[PDB]
Amino acid sequence: DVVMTQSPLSLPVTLGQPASISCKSSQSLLDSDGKTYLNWFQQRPGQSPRRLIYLVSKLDSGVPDRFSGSGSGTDFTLKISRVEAEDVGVYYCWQGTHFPRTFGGGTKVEIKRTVAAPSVFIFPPSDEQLKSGTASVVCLLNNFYPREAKVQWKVDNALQSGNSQESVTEQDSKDSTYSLSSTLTLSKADYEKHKVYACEVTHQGLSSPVTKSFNRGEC
Amino acid sequence: QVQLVQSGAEVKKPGASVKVSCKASGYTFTNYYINWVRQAPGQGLEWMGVINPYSGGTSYNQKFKGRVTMTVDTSTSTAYMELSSLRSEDTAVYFCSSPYWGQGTLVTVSSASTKGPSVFPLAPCSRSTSESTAALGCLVKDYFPEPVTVSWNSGALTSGVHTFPAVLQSSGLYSLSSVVTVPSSSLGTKTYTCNVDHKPSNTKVDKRVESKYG
Amino acid sequence: GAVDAERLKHLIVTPSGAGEQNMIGMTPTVIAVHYLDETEQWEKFGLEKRQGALELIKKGYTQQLAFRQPSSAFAAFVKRAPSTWLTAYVVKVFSLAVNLIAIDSQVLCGAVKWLILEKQKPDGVFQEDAPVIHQEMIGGLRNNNEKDMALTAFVLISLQEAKDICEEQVNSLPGSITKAGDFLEANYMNLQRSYTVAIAGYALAQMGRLKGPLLNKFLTTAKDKNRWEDPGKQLYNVEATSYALLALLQLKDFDFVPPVVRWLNEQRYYGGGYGSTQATFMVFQALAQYQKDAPDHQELNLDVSLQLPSR
């Protein structure tokens, strides 16, 4: 099957500045009917794709002329001459020549702002939840930029893996930051065998990893 | 302008079948092929197949051959996608595109039953802090299906609120957190209540969030 | 898919010479400004280049008036017998230029009146009594067959393009248009050349008379539904197909348009060159009209090919 490769994965942009995204196919998208079925769309979180470009370089109806597409054979580019706020979202290319039709993995266009370290908070499990036989421990990273962040759970200094899940907000429309919540889940029995619960955060805005921790049953 | 209006969210057991509809308006229905594409949560897109509404002719991704059927009813301008022998990995938003895209239909494939959330507090053990701001929250745990909504103080409190996307636990139930950052000096004087709604279970909960200690 | 202004810079021509040669020069400049206006390319191409182009169109116009005879007809030289074709071509270019420079209504409507009162036969046919010297400037009309139909259509199209200005000045005009339409309508089904099918097709479409069997003949004459062509010079087929596009846009047949625009774009014909006058004027007139009436129209799903493999 034809592989569509987009670059970069994330593209931080400045309002009023140009943006460029790459899409490469594993083979030529020139069809025997003579057209090249290379498409671009924009998807803004929770939404239906907005069609932007078809046949490599044709703007869809109403799409503003700051958008342009180019390329041939296997190398395609989408450009925005001057980025506007409504241009943030995930950009996909996809090919309609070969079967099956195939999509690129997406390029996230986001608002660039100054580096901002997370405010980090750790929340112990509630007595109410412990009564039911489970302990959820939560780690909040509030209002940071850029999106790249690493949470490492430690339980008496043993690195935890597989027993946490995390999710991240969309870029804030007012301050261009992200926030991140991570939940560590243990049985009450396991929780009660260990003392030190720690979430260790690595982010570009910190000079080194910051740890928030509590000792079970101590305030 | 052109719109494609798709049928609502579906919850199906593994092995069941789902039939999604796509009603088109604003263009000559028979002039445009209709692509069906899916997107798993947090993931990219996979093409399912296409139908030519003029001839009725179909072409499918061979990955779904035997389990996917696409039809149109030209006299209602509606396209349908039926997918059978449903699998957990079939959980996705299904789109029609002709070439404008529908709003998508979430199909969740799970053996879980409808269940209302438990709401637990997220609070520091002490109201005492050296920091000018404190984080509070609500952990909305063990519900099915999506979605839940959360407000704070009945919608009066919106600044500093972050409500996170839900995660699907290995139990097959969702869990969501909602947090707010507030002035440290307000703890134990101002109140902070999360208002949780899970319509599929008729669950409405108000959780007041306080610390165990001063 | 607007044609890039950078590809059209050679169409900004200083007109010069006698009553035919001056129009050969004025043609590319008028149609280039027309087309760059409708496609909004002056900001990118150079706002400052438009004033210079208008100056050259004004020069064209002022120079052409040296060839206006007392009758209001035109010929190459003031002592040459007036050309029905050249006069109607002057009406065609000046009618289109009216939003670019000041055109004297006396000049435009004088030429229209002369064509109707001197060169229209009682059956509605327009006759040429003094052919132009530069036969290469008349495009596909240079063919010997279907002369009465092809020239009647050419002149009728100029009258229809002048009608807004000249109707309220020339009371013979609506009757002339009706009689010319009657002749074209009565003889259309007997046409053999795609060129005449196209130009008589546009002339009838402007009057709402390209209907029923005549419309079916017009449409089924196209090859692969994208072009009107005869087996000769390719310039004539670019012209034919431009007249056919103008007819489709008059018919509001928007689903038939995109394949014809694709075929014109694929000829990569940017105008200019020997014998280019009609192709240059008609291709940019037809693409400007397309840009105005149905820009980037899409008649099917162009995200994907038409293939339906069923394995």
Residue numbers in the entry:
A (entry chain L): 1 to 219
B (entry chain H): 1 to 214
C (entry chain C): 0 to 310
Describing publication, verbatim:
We created a library of bifunctional fusion proteins that direct a fragment of the complement negative regulator, complement receptor type 1 (CR1) to sites of tissue injury. Tissue targeting is accomplished through the binding of the fusion protein to complement C3 fragments that contain a surface-exposed C3d domain and which are covalently deposited on tissues where complement is being activated. C3b is inactivated and converted into ligands for complement receptors through cleavage by factor I, cofactors and proteases forming a series of fragments designated iC3b, C3dg and C3d. C3dg is further cleaved by a protease to form the C3d fragment. These C3 cleavage products are deposited at high density in tissue through covalent binding via an exposed common thioester domain (TED) at sites of complement activation.
To refine our understanding of the epitope to which the3d8b mAb binds,we carried out two orthogonal epitopemapping studies, linear peptide screening and cocrystallization. Crystallization studies can better distinguish conformational epitopes and allow the antibody paratope to be determined. The C3d epitope is locked in place by a salt bridge, ten H-bonds, and numerous water-mediated H-bonds and Van der Waals interactions. However, the impact of these two contacts appear to be negligible in their contribution to the overall binding of the Fab to C3d. A similar sequence with 93% and 67% identity is found in cynomolgus and mouse C3d, respectively. We identified the epitope, which is located at the C-terminus of C3d, a site common to the TED containing C3 fragments iC3b, C3dg and C3d.
